[PDB]
Fold this protein.
Amino acid sequence: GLTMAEYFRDEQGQDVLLFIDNIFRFTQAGSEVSALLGRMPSAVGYQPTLATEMGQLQERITSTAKGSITSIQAIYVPADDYTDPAPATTFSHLDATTNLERKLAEMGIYPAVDPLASTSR
Amino acid sequence: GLTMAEYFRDEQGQDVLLFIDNIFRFTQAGSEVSALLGRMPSAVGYQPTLATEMGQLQERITSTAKGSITSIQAIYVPADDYTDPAPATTFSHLDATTNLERKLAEMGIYPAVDPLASTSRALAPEIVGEEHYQVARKVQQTLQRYKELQDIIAILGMDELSDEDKLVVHRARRIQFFLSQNFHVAEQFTGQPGSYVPVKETVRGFKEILEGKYDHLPEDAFRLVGRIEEVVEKAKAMGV
Amino acid sequence: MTRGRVIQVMGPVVDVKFENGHLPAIYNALKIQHKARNENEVDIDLTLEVALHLGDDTVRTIAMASTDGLIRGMEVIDTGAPISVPVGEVTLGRVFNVLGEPIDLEGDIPADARRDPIHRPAPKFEELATEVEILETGIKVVDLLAPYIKGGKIGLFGGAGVGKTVLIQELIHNIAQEHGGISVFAGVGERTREGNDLYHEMKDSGVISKTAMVFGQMNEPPGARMRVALTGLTMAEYFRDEQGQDVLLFIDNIFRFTQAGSEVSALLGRMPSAVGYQPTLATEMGQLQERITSTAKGSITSIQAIYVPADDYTDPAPATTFSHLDATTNLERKLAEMGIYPAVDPLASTSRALAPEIVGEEHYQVARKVQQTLQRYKELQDIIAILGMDELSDEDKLVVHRARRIQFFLSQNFHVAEQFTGQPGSYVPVKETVRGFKEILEGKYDHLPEDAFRLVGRIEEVVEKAKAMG
Amino acid sequence: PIESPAPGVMDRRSVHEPLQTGIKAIDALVPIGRGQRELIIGDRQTGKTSVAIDTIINQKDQNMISIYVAIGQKESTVRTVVETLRKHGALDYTIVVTASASQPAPLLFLAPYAGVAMGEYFMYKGKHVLVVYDDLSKQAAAYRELSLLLRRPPGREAYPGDIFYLHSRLLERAAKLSDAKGGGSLTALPFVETQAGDISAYIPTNVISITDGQIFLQSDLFFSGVRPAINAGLSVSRVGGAAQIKAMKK
Amino acid sequence: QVSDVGTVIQVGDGIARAHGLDNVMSGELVEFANGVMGMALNLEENNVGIVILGPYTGIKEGDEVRRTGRIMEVPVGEALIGRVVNPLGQPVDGLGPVETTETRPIESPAPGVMDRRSVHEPLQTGIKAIDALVPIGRGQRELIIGDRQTGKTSVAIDTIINQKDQNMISIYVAIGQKESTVRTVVETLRKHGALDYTIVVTASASQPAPLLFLAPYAGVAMGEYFMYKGKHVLVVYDDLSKQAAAYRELSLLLRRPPGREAYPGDIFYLHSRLLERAAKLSDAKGGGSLTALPFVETQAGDISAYIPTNVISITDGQIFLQSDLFFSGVRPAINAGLSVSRVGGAAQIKAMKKVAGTLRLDLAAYRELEAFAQFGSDLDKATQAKLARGARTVEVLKQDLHQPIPVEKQVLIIYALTRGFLDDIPVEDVRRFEKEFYLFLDQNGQHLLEHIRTTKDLPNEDDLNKAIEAFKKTFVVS
Amino acid sequence: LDAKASEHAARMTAMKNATDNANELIRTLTLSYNRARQAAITQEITEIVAGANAL
Ligand SMILES: Nc1ncnc2c1ncn2[C@@H]1O[C@H](COP(=O)(O)OP(=O)(O)OP(=O)(O)O)[C@@H](O)[C@H]1O
Ligand SMILES: Nc1ncnc2c1ncn2[C@@H]1O[C@H](COP(=O)(O)OP(=O)(O)OP(=O)(O)O)[C@@H](O)[C@H]1O
Ligand SMILES: Nc1ncnc2c1ncn2[C@@H]1O[C@H](COP(=O)(O)OP(=O)(O)OP(=O)(O)O)[C@@H](O)[C@H]1O
Ligand SMILES: [Mg+2]
Ligand SMILES: [Mg+2]
Ligand SMILES: [Mg+2]
């Protein structure tokens, strides 16, 4: 998907939006591939190359002279644990963060964005 | 032992009592010998074939159309961790289980059977009757509420509970003490002779305790007795 | 022959191949001394320590420095003995590294001096003294509530800026003055600037003339960080083995020794233990601590600071270390800011020697009464914070009256503290301080003002100070 | 031999002879009989060695051999223990086996077996023996060291799989022999050191699962003046009643 | 011959094995066929393990490896000033090659115990809270620790900018950040004029793990040149946590056993080697010095984590930034209660030391009495002094972005705060009062400013008081 | 009025004691949790080491 998106700025100077369904599943797939290849597990069983893979994916989403790619990515948080490596390692690449709360969702307030936890530079 | 019991079940059609002193040692020895057989370690150090080896042994201990075998097995729990794989995988192979607790053992309330974690498939209204089932469920509910109240009691004091919760605690302590019993084989440890209590007597006594008839008796009068009457004589001996 | 060559280099681990029938023994020292033949080489002067015999005339060794620049096939020569360091009077006042090479600028020790092996079996069961004896430090609180034992191990705990270094200097001064002994400091795996500051402090105090120092600090490789403790320990052993003295041995951090051992085991490839430590943790702790003992002609007592990871005393390294300690002293920042020096927390500090069979019935009774009075005052302070002083009974008033004077009398003037207090120090005998505390408990000095007990030596100096004040 | 089979089912007899240790807190509610095995478990500096030495000293006026095995102790501590035994007169019938912390792991692993083998001679000659193991926990640590040096896979808490077998093989050999075997007996008092009073740890549970009862000494009670520090809730004797005289049992 | 050449027999995850290279040295640099550099790490019996310092996707089995004959080293010299460069000394901003003529090895011994001297020279960061509560001396290693988006980078950039007229050389090491973020930092430095004395070392997240692992060592090697030439150097490490993550990646790829909490057993040695090379040299070794500001990121302020504990044990102090304070509008977010510098305080100037004591007491008292503000009462014990002076202190300790101020002006304003001259001014007007007071000083107090700048001590108290009163006459409350 | 003042003082002291007790429980439970989870972490490390060795 990133390769398909990069063309519209590299050859046409467009401003393009790239939407990613879930980064957590990407990290899970990377960990599974590492386990299949037989590398020693990382902190909680992830791949040792988690940070490098995250950097390789995210660093190509940048703005240049010809155009720019802005990305909206959904991140799944297992069991509310924000300390988990998959949510944790992606924080360093985000300019703005949005937090959704099931407590707000059950009250009928959509989009249920937490107004005190959301931050932006 | 199972080979002998199987013959007694099959070739003669007789009822068999099978007692296994500790079935955990079988899997423990299997895990000890696994490493020298070239198997890779699994879970916390157990053999990969833990489930299949246990199943091959457990599935032979069953009642058939030509003979019934009732078996009582004691299962050791390493490091008091009920989530250990050996205790965990053997739960599915049992129809009735009783869980003992070191916390209850320390309190002196033997046999220290956990009243909540212990389960059985015979506890149904059509098997034991509504009179028994309602009493059992009410006892479990009261004990669960008393367990929940511990934190608020500790961090707020007893006087801050509502009159409903005060009564709940008052009944639950007496129920927990009455759950204890004096065993015949325990006479070598303590001088009390022991007793045998019928199911009707147990149900009637617990129903009477739940009804509030014995709220005026002291707490310790319910410890290590038989029928509900012995509580009354023990209280009279203490001087009520 | 006694010459070999390098076949494998993997970080600090070096494998050396020797001729058949001429392998070096375990713990032996091997020297690599190479000059660059051409522009693509560098000069190398490195020492190795034999660890394992891998078979096929191959030996696995660990280096005491960086192995960068090594080339497969360089010649290695065996010294035929373990690491040897100089011992004797020449070591006093100097600073050494793990290899025994002087770090200071005073010059190198001549090659004709006596040197002793680093590795040595522990003293035998026959040689040990059959009696437990108290080491009279001359500090009132230590001699009263946490007595030290000759040949014993003492753990030193406290926050930063409370006075651990000052207490160490005072202990060295008192021992070298009254008992005629010396001290050795080995700062294992700590700050180089801290070591420099300690060196300058000893030079200022004049204590440096009676002590020897080995550092091997954080920047050093794990092998050096592990063997610094042993080289300091053998420098300490010499004096009591030959001259029969009583020697102080200071280790700045014993936890770094175990950490370096774990790192070395990981390099060697041994399977990690429970929490990633080496399987030989308890064994190595044994060969280290079992050489610090009292014998029929001398004794070595050690003051050790122990780091507790994550404040968990159940961690394997603190658990193994605590099995050897005989006493514990805790520096207290609240007392330090209150103005009591030394601020050594009379309630928290404990000692195994505090028993009637070892220290005496009168001493034990006095210590227990003082501890009970201090605990009672600690309880009473909470009621003071609630109701005020006047509501307490006259018995509680008397208890506070005695406790304040006892707590003030626990303070003492150190010899080293003169440099920023003006007043000279004092050495207080254990019998003298016991008699003084007994007299204070008897109420014989209640009429004196409490400030006369602020900072003083013997009990007679208290009444002299009160008389001079008014 | 170091490795010897334990007495069988038919070679044993029920314990019926009290072993008076001279301590009320033991003789009253945690009785010890001849042929029983009873561990003393607690934190460091709690009085386990004092209890063992007092039990050994109390046997002066009875015909029984005592064996004290020190595993992982300081040489100075062993020297002081020997000096106290000599002062009180226990060395006339006591054998001391020592393996200090500076000794290699194999000797630490081997010492308790040497002690029990020494006791076997007197037990099978028809005499009564008391054996004390000073740190089965340190024995387990040494065995773990050896196993990981042999690259055997580690289990719970990095201990080898046969850590239970190691202790059971040793402790099972103490027994009360029958009249056909000569009526001898061997009493064992193993020691286990806990961390922060945690009785749920792997090694404490393993050793408790083998013996005939435990004496739990609590640090919180050792402080604040209750020096024996007996914890009645966690302590138990599985040969109670039979191991007491009729009066004390009554 | 196969002594100076070799052939790759294994490639994977940035690690390669080569056959040959008989004369290669341990820790040497090697050259691949396509120009990618590598390090000879393991000299096994019949093969050499190589860590690839670049894109390994272009390397196949069977290509040639060329020996270079040099232990790993980085270019050094004054020619690096004003340029952004990778850990290997290759420029990344274009602008032509860097024409230096000197090199220095990456792995070098730290200064000896006899080569060091006690820290005695102040380091002016331009931040009120840092210069007041946690003074930093030249040669000290001070840790900056906090959660995400707490202003650690802003503090570092302000400190670097404040060195404009100080005779200090700054080195900024970016480890694992976004390349765009590094670009923005460079742009701000260029705008404020700090590139005249600053070297920037960058290693983006897309780079291989060895480059991230080596970047701070390259920064130290660059700094040591100026340190041993007699100059003063400042080095900033932006993610020691990301360095640790990269080193754990490399160690796991090398199949070394994990240690405590999945980190390698020598993760403490890794940081100790790096942070131990900053020191104050004795007069025999010259007057040079190097000071370091490592950065560590916590999870929800959990100081007790493994890496924060290791760095705290290594360094001489810490500065803690709190997310709650940052969100509450206190942008400096420095927690004076937990922050401490232990080598510092002796290097602080006399004039500032004379007021820091009162400032600490006032701020601390406010910091235990803020929670009672639900109902102000008890008269002077709470209201007139603790609630008022503390609120005014919090107001004056705030500072705008990229606006460092001189230490003399800091001394003036903090003296005015402590002596009660701000008791009548309402809280909303305190910042405007300070801003106008700075201009009034620049217009009328040249004598006081020169006296402080030349004597490092407070001027005459009567003159200072009359100047403050003269300014307060002209101020209007609004 | 005096009874009202006494009531307010009693509620003050009761709530202060309740907060102290709750904070003590918080400290104990946090210590227990921190001591508990490190054992699981070390068990995971041990499993990784054993798996690597067995191959
Ligand atoms: N006996 C004493 N009498 C008076 N003041 C003392 C005494 N001991 C220490 N101090 C004061 O306390 C300060 C701390 O001393 P010192 O440096 O020895 O402490 P420390 O606990 O070893 O420190 P750190 O852990 O920071 O190295 C001294 O500089 C001195 O001002
Ligand atoms: N009944 C008692 N009365 C008084 N003191 C006692 C008693 N029992 C033990 N002690 C004292 O308690 C201390 C510790 O006792 P002991 O050495 O037997 O403990 P331990 O658990 O074996 O110790 P360690 O772990 O150091 O080997 C000693 O000073 C001893 O004198
Ligand atoms: N004193 C200040 N005044 C105003 N804005 C500030 C101040 N300090 C920081 N900020 C802003 O707050 C945000 C924090 O970003 P900054 O990079 O400084 O934080 P950080 O803790 O290093 O975080 P990161 O992990 O994102 O690198 C930025 O938008 C910065 O401009
Ligand atoms: Mg110090
Ligand atoms: Mg003992
Ligand atoms: Mg940043």
Q: What stands out?
A: The domain at 130-238 of chain B is CATH 1.10.1140.10 (Bovine Mitochondrial F1-ATPase, ATP Synthase Beta Chain; Chain D, domain3). Chain B is about 45% helix and 5% strand. The pocket of magnesium ion (ligand 6) is lined by residues E 152-153, 238 (CB under 6 Å). Chain B touches chain D at residues 28, 31-32, 34-35, 41, 44-45, 76, 78-80, 102, 105-108, 188-189, 191 (CB under 8 Å).
